[PDB]
């Protein structure tokens, strides 16, 4: 989930934008 | 700001800046 993708590894725009409504 | 480790409030702030008026979901586990 996000923590894995963006906290414990380096985040990206691609991935963050998936969580937008 | 997005291309780094983003945790806690720093993550939530990145989500807010990227998503703008869309909003988002932050779901830790």
Author numbering:
A (entry chain A): 1 to 21
B (entry chain B): 1 to 29
Please give me the paper's original passages concerning this structure.
It contains six cysteine residues (Cys) forming three disulfide bonds, two of them link the two chains and one intra-chain bond is found in the A-chain. At micromolar concentrations it self-associates into dimers.
The structure of the B25C-dimer was determined by X-ray crystallography and refined to a resolution of 2.0 Å. The crystals belonged to the cubic space group I213 with cell dimensions a = b = c = 77.9 Å with one monomer in the asymmetric unit. The dimeric structure was formed by applying appropriate symmetry operations. The crystal structure reveals that disulfide bonds were formed correctly with no disulfide scrambling and the two monomers were linked via a new disulfide bond formed between the introduced Cys in position B25 of each monomer. Overall, no significant conformational perturbations caused by the introduction of the additional disulfide bond at position B25 could be observed. The dimer was found to bind with markedly decreased affinity compared to HI (IC50 = 0.0012% relative to HI in the same plate, n = 3, SD = 0.00008%). However, significant improvements in stability of B25C-dimer relative to HI were demonstrated by markedly slower processing of the precursor with ALP, an almost 40°C increase in Tm, more than 44 kJ/mol increase in ΔH in DSC measurements and no fibrillation in ThT assay. Our results underline that the dimerization of insulin is responsible for insulin stability, while the monomeric form is required for this hormone's activity.
